[PDB]
């Protein structure tokens, strides 16, 4: 089908446009590509907008999406803000099958989009380790003191596999609950190194 060249987009505040690659693999299919960004609540904000807002990808092809900052510098400047970028591949009307019963599937890819204010003091890579934990006998709470969203994955409490989790800037998340292990996904989509669950 159509696939994106990343699993997330880092938008650095200040830049007028971030680029995102899309690619159609299906040698004999034509798709209309439409793209948009939503805020953390699912609302189609106009905070970010996608460049070309609507084009065709005929056969094996490669295109560039340009995500423009439409915020009016109205976003928090001391922490990331989570948005969702969706790129939808509208398949062409198949005229042959007008007189039959059909199901068309429109495949969409949805990835994180983090707006990243330009002067964060701690750096993206010094973020994961800075996590801490607070235990209860029902739950395990993650305390993210950094200004970056943390994709906590491979959350282990001894033998136990806990919920994967998304911990926001200078905030916390909670999971149903020994020695705590955890990884994080970075800006590149790669798993950080297994780390030791340090308490608060």
């Amino acid at each position: 089908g159509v696939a994106l060249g990343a699993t997330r987009v880092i938008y650095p505040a200040g830049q007028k446009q971030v680029q995102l690659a899309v690619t159609n693999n299906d040698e004999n299919s034509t798709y209309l590509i439409q793209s948009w960004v939503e805020n953390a609540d699912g609302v189609k904000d106009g905070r970010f907008i996608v460049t070309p807002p609507l084009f065709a990808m005929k056969g094996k092809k490669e295109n560039t999406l340009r995500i423009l900052d439409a915020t009016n510098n109205q976003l928090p400047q001391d922490r990331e803000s989570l948005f969702w970028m969706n790129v939808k591949a509208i398949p062409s009307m198949d005229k042959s099958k007008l007189t039959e019963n059909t199901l068309q599937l429109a495949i969409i890819s949805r990835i994180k989009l983090y707006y990243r204010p330009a002067k964060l003091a701690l750096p993206p890579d010094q973020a994961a380790e800075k996590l801490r934990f607070r235990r209860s006998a029902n739950s395990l709470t993650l305390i993210n003191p950094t200004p970056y969203y943390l994709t906590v994955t491979e959350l282990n409490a001894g033998t136990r596999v806990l919920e994967n989790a998304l911990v926001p800037p200078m905030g916390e998340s909670a999971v149903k609950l020994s020695n705590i292990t955890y990884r994080t996904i970075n800006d590149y989509g790669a798993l950080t190194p297994k780390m030791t669950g340090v308490m608060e």
Partner: protein, 279 residues
Amino acid sequence: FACKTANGTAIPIGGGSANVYVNLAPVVNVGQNLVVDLSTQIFCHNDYPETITDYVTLQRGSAYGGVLSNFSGTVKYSGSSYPFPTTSETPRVVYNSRTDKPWPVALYLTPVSSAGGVAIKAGSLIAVLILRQTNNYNSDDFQFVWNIYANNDVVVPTGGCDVSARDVTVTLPDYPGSVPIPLTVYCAKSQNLGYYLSGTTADAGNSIFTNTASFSPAQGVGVQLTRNGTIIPANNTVSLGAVGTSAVSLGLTANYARTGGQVTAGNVQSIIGVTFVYQ
């Protein structure tokens, strides 16, 4: 004949060996070129140009560590591109000056699809390039060995996956029945995937997608989806777990479900979204 490196570390008249430390593009996508330009760090001169002429070749180039496993590509020597790792000694270039000129060698490397994270580790050996020098005077045949060490990590960001849907599916029955919907996903780098459905729904339960045929339409019929028997309502994320190289089927069936008053014969056509959500 002799050569030295931009860090001013030399290999004298008989040939011999040296390290070159290259700062690479820190992030390279699967389709892009990682260019390792050695003509800005490796410099040679002929020592007696008024009498002797020097002949210089790329005798061999070999790739190591993360360049050998995650990259494909070429070597441009003096205007021509050969395969790298190399398959044979290139043509000569002439050095006929005492002033240091570059050895015109550049590696053009493209990450393959299977490469992920750190495709070249900081501090590791990326390549070994052998400069071979001969002349029109004696039978001198010397080897200058340049060991290319990467100073930093080269990251190949993972891409989204590929959702291969064989058709734009005939659900006929015009009957009355059910049909599988061939829909598989695969990722070049194993990641957790989730999906959710979206479109116009007719029911409180919000799993029956409206009929939208606009050419002699049926009536009373919607289209519902099932993943091995389990109905999938719109906006309800279905967890696929880790999807790697091997295509995971979503195990979809299209079914007709009722939406209202008299069921009426005619065409039944619906369009549904399927949103795959990345971790």
